[model samples]
Target: SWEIDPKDLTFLKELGTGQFGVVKYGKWRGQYDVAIKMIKEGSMSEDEFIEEAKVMMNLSHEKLVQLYGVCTKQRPIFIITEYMANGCLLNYLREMRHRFQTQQLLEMCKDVCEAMEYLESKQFLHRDLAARNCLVNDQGVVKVSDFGLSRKFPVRWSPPEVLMYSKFSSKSDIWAFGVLMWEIYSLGKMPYERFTNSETAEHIAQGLRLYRPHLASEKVYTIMYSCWHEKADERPTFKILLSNILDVMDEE
Candidate 1:
């Protein structure tokens, strides 16, 4: 039912490039503006692509990117989603560094937390949750994207269990979300900027955690620190994370 006719879609301009393929701004049926992600051949098998699409189609949330349809019969299969005018969240934070206050930054984090909470309730693991995988709309709302499509393991964003055992769980997503919050407060600085991927793994295994961003208050940093607990079970779920964030925002 989500199949889109390639003939009805008109390519406009290239939006950006991602791990899977080139994302372009396009028009569907001469009326709707959409982002068309052209999945590069050999990037992944067609069956895998369809499976990811199916997962996205069933998920509907305000803070999550909405999948419009797909063009599977074509050479470069299209995974169409709603267009986000402000582009990637990481880029937006870096470019608009002075434009946001601490309160606004926390709000952005809360938006993501809400989305992750919804995913957790549905028993879905984002697998790859980072500021780079999110997008900002023209109105500046952040929305999570690129669900389970990443092929490479993200070392800096990962926790010790994930690095050592190759295990993935919702708690792993929480660990990554903590790093993402660091990215936000630091205005998109890369985590462990001074360490190599191997060095990062060693440090994480040794219980090294990222320093608090100057922009983050003590309470905010507390939430981030809670996510970096050595034991996965010690980490809070997205439900608790969202509630804590709301409390922080309310107190501010």
Candidate 2:
């Protein structure tokens, strides 16, 4: 397990907020840089956080966040993880897409698709999959991070099955992946920003798709379109998705 303790960290600045607590930019052992996720004691039970940490601890992938350790012996629980320099992908898409080439955006999408393909291969269903949950590094690496089933989901990205029955599977993640692609290509646009979740659900269930005259490339839209197929069984696996997006990148 993690040998580092909470006392070993020195908080530098508050990074951001989360469903249960505040995130702090901190250092480990006065030398190692890290992201300190501070979760309130009562906001989530110790056992609950412990279980989540256990899962995170066991996970190790280039595109996934690396959990270092946890300090749950006191009031404010601290979860230590590797620091991601560039912050959230959603913000990057909104603020910097205009500064980057379309090929670069396609690469970011490919990174996430490969990450999801790994998760799919492991049989892990990422219940939460959105642009906000993905992080980027200074090196331009897009890594999947900040995920769980405890918090409320971004309904606009969710598939009909997730809303109707609260069920989750790889298929549901593919649906969310489709929304992420839309967000990346549309410059962080919300899928159903103007409509309520229930309304969007109804509209989506009725077969309305994202058609804002975006992504003029038919091949690119086709890959995204396949992810939102009404039948979950019809949606492409993350493997196929990675390949399709990679092809788009090659064409571009």
Candidate with maximal lDDT: 1
lDDT of each: 0.86, 0.79
lDDT of 1 by residue, 113-164 (tens): 9999999988889988999999998898999988854226689888888988
- Writing each residue's lDDT as its tens digit, candidate 2 over 1-252 gives 643576777867776533333457888888777886667557777777778777667767888867788887766767777788777788877777248666777788888998889888878778888898898888989998875412356788888888888878999999999888888888887777799777888899799988732543688789888899988899999999998987877786
Q: Give the clashing pairs for model 2.
A: none
Candidate 2 accuracy as lDDT: 0.79
lDDT, candidate 1, at 71: 80
Q: What lDDT does candidate 1 reach at residue 60? A: 90
For residue 148, give model 1's deviation from the true position in Å.
3.3
Local lDDT at 24 for model 1: 72
> What's the distance in Å from true for residue 252, model 1?
0.9
Worst 10 residues of 2 by lDDT: 15-24
Model 2 vs. true fold: TM = 0.88
Off by over 4 Å in 1: 15-23, 29-31, 42-48, 149-152
Model 1 RMSD, rounded to 1 decimal: 2.8
RMSD of each: 2.8, 3.2
